[PDB]
Amino acid sequence: RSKEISIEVEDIKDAGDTGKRLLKINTPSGARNIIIENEDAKALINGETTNTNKKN
Amino acid sequence: VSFTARAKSNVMAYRLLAYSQGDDIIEISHAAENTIPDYVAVKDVDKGDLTQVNM
């Protein structure tokens, strides 16, 4: 009868929507895409800014 | 029912056992710590000795 019963993210009944997205994410870039909504701030944190991002 | 097991490494009576596989015949050894065992030894079984598992 198995040994571990590896649950999945959606089995965690009091996890939040952003919380489940973060738990599923594999890389730091993916996490930043979830967490940072302001596109200019995200661009700064990614070290990749256009002239429009810089002005903003 | 029962089936043939090939032991694996010095099985002791009353100890918790776990199955594996190798060449063919299911191999039996003592179950690893902190898990769910598969069978209980009823008698001592030598490393490469064939025996039965009484299901």
How many other β-carbons are positioned within 10 Å of the β-carbon of residue B33? 6
CB B28 within 8 A of CB B52: no
CB B32 within 8 A of CB B12: no
Check CB contact under 8 Å for A1 and B36. yes
Question: Closest Cα of chain B to A3: distance in Å?
Answer: 6
Residues of chain B with Cβ-Cβ distance to A2 below 8 Å are 36
Residue B2 in contact with partner chain A when CB distance is under 8 A? no
Return d(Cα B11, Cα B17) in angstroms, integer. Answer: 8
Residue A55 in contact with partner chain B when CB distance is under 8 A? no
How does DSSP assign chain B, residue by residue? -EEEE---S-B-TT-EEEEE-SSSSPEEEEPPSSS---EE-SS-B-TT--EEEE-
CB B55 within 8 A of CB B5: no
Return d(Cα A51, Cα B52) in angstroms, integer. Answer: 76
The structure was resolved experimentally with cryo-EM
According to DSSP, residue A9 is labeled G
* Resolution (Å units): 3.2
